[PDB]
Structure 1
């Protein structure tokens, strides 16, 4: 089909000249003669019937003049119920060594976004079981959740815990898109779900599909794996009227990969160094990941915050695309509170007394206010001394510290790290416990009793153990 020839191989950007009709942009080009499959996606019509293409795999071995065919369609991936329990690449190739993925329906990774009249206006609440999330920044069923955080702050652990708590319980299928992450973590997740039962290698009851492009992959591949995963999720939303859970790790890699190829594509660098087409491409991806009126897709996306700078363009743009945001602060993790959710930075759209209820809203706002007042008091402490503050100031500091400790919750996925058994706190118990702490009913209990506990019943019980060991 209009067999082209490679005219230049610079980095991942390969230019092909088509003597016959030029392939339209975003179509997939297959390089002939390579032992494996190398797919070149058209990016620009440079001119003189030449297309600038970004390779989806390594460009080593390419020789000028090599024949390149045109598929005629954007990269098409095997999609359907048969992808569950299978690991697939960006170009939809089985990488689990379990044979070909035999799906009767193929879909292209590139597609238009859902229309405005297809947007749903409902806002439910998803009880993850995490005290910080459910109280301060409640997640919503179908909403777009964002796990903002730096490096080594808890994004991967938190997302795996969310998979364990929600996805396992959720009857609908789930999709995990490992965009630009460590390959070791991908294998860990694959093995963990095998033993957990979410992926069954024997039967056909698997409930989670895996799309992985790790950082070992070339920049081009790392910029489309998210599109492949969301295409699979879209199939599980439109073709099948089911609720889906799309878990993507480090969406930031989607933006970063574009920055690694924009210069070769021929674009003038934008601020800091990202590609000029940052917001547009990010929206094109994100708008597709929504809950239409046909079906719901509750998406949890981990977003790496470069150098813990939220003002960085990549995390900054993604804030507008997410209904519920949970920012993991390194300073809190240094304090030891795990999860390291920043109580005064995390926000959710359903945090509305009409939606979450008056009591829930009041308790959450009280917690946030007391923590703000504690932040204010710390500056005074640094100069005056703790033994100089007023009794009201000391009471506020004590209660705020107790609340901060009670925010910490041991995770089942973190049982290996912390050593404590994982706990899941119901929303009612979370609200009741934080309300009691705000009231002061547990002021007599030491702060240590509130650290790494589940419900306040565990909190008071721990205090008694310490007294018995005193």
Structure 2
């Protein structure tokens, strides 16, 4: 039926229905603007009024103004007639290529895969990125998390993965841009048309795009994470297919939450966040998963505010991943890209029974010398290298090489590194370190291992200097 706006503040609006009253989650439809202004019920305040989160600007609304119930959730296009199309948070298309004629629809909200549907299929997914492979490998159909503070190189890394992975990949990929840079989208689009994962000519397109960037209202950023969610969901279930879900940046989802939780009228929780940060997340999060039916390999970039890895946002999210890659400004500032913290990135499959105890052994051997170097880090800073015992003078030099040989010039920042984009296969990864560790190379300069491919390019470099 019909009801009216009685309160408006930011993205929170209060509608009064005399007849009937929409379930919590029903997309409402504002009647009176040149622009589809979906509200979304989130509360029943009583006195036959509901409280809703907008999905766009609310300049203009007035106390009065009619609203129609849609009788349903926000529902969007799903199916194969999405591949190649850019769609926004409510399904509307935004690549200015007409409408998205599609058989079926789905709602953005949805209960999550019951326990019986889970699958324990753990098979390694090689990236050709030395640190990731050697120390905390990604797992096929696993949840992956990229943690980073402003500017440490999440977006680059997600891109390199999209390249070393979703280019030679028989199967559908969905990319949800949640509250990041609009120009990064324009950039993706073009980059994927040229490379031809998207094709304007055909229906040979292998990717769907869902975008709600850092210029749109809380509501929109709040939700869009789920739009793109729903899409990937279909390709998994009604297609029992291999889905690749990339999000950037999942943080902006919790953030946007925070912006609204204030006026929804919850009482503030730790650090000002919404009371409901763990579940708000966890519902949404647990839908992103590989089930018996289909299979989603997820890769989410996670922003870390003020570099605070304990900020509730990043802090809570860790629970939800199977492999994590954590980026430190500290490292990046030493020109060690990709900026991966070797002692803080982990995978739930670094396990000899899964990766074969040559892998597991060279790993924890690097991970050891590094964390041995790291302990000396203090005495070296106050007294200097010389006060270091002879044994220890080495543990440094070797470690420092490892430190340097985990750097790897990506095929993207061929522009910042200038250097040619390498991709190193698990074998030569595992090998090279093993050698470095067994000190075949204590005769080579440090630099020799900074920014290279296999260990050859290392020993090779060392010559061109001499």
TM-score normalised over the length of structure 1: 0.98
Q: CA deviation at 1:390?
A: 2.2
Q: Aligned partners of 2:328 and 2:247: how far apart in 1?
A: 20
The SS at the match of 1:245 is strand
CA displacement, residues 292-324 of structure 1 (integer Å, 9 cap, x when unaligned): 100110000011011111111011110001111
The SS at the match of 2:139 is coil
Q: Aligned partners of 2:378 and 2:85: how far apart in 1?
A: 54
Q: CA deviation at 1:31?
A: 0.5
Q: CA deviation at 1:383?
A: 2.9
Q: CA deviation at 1:411?
A: 0.6
Q: CA deviation at 1:385?
A: 2.0
Aligned to 2:55: 56
CA displacement, residues 318-345 of structure 1 (integer Å, 9 cap, x when unaligned): 0001111110011000011100010000
Q: Aligned partners of 1:417 and 1:86: how far apart in 2?
A: 31
The SS at the match of 1:459 is helix
Q: Aligned partners of 1:20 and 1:135: how far apart in 2?
A: 63
Q: CA deviation at 1:235?
A: 0.4
Runs of 4+ in 1 over 4 A off after TM superposition: none
Aligned to 2:295: 296
Q: Aligned partners of 1:413 and 1:22: how far apart in 2?
A: 52
CA displacement, residues 111-159 of structure 1 (integer Å, 9 cap, x when unaligned): 0000000000111100011000001110000110000111000100000
Q: Aligned partners of 2:261 and 2:306: how far apart in 1?
A: 22
The SS at the match of 2:8 is strand
The SS at the match of 2:272 is coil
Name whichever of 147-156 and 388-397 sits farther off. 388-397
CA displacement, residues 247-272 of structure 1 (integer Å, 9 cap, x when unaligned): 00021111011110111101000010
CA displacement, residues 219-254 of structure 1 (integer Å, 9 cap, x when unaligned): 000011110011000001000110101100021111
Q: Aligned partners of 1:357 and 1:375: how far apart in 2?
A: 27
Q: Aligned partners of 1:425 and 1:36: how far apart in 2?
A: 50
CA RMSD of aligned residues (A): 0.8
CA displacement, residues 361-412 of structure 1 (integer Å, 9 cap, x when unaligned): 0100010110011111221212332133222111111111100110001111
Q: CA deviation at 1:285?
A: 0.4
Q: Aligned partners of 1:206 and 1:387: how far apart in 2?
A: 60
Aligned to 1:239: 238
Q: Aligned partners of 1:415 and 1:140: how far apart in 2?
A: 27
The SS at the match of 2:125 is coil
Q: CA deviation at 1:40?
A: 0.2
Q: CA deviation at 1:287?
A: 0.7
The SS at the match of 1:177 is strand
The SS at the match of 1:135 is helix
Q: Aligned partners of 1:436 and 1:87: how far apart in 2?
A: 48
Q: Aligned partners of 1:73 and 1:160: how far apart in 2?
A: 36
**Tell me, which stretches of 5 or more residues in structure 1 are unaligned?**
none
Q: CA deviation at 1:45?
A: 0.5
Q: Aligned partners of 1:92 and 1:417: how far apart in 2?
A: 37
Q: Aligned partners of 1:416 and 1:92: how far apart in 2?
A: 35
Aligned to 1:178: 177
Aligned to 2:324: 325
Q: Aligned partners of 1:447 and 1:334: how far apart in 2?
A: 17
Q: Aligned partners of 1:179 and 1:462: how far apart in 2?
A: 41
Q: Aligned partners of 1:351 and 1:19: how far apart in 2?
A: 59
How many residue pairs are counted as aligned between the two chains?
466
The SS at the match of 1:263 is helix
The SS at the match of 1:437 is helix
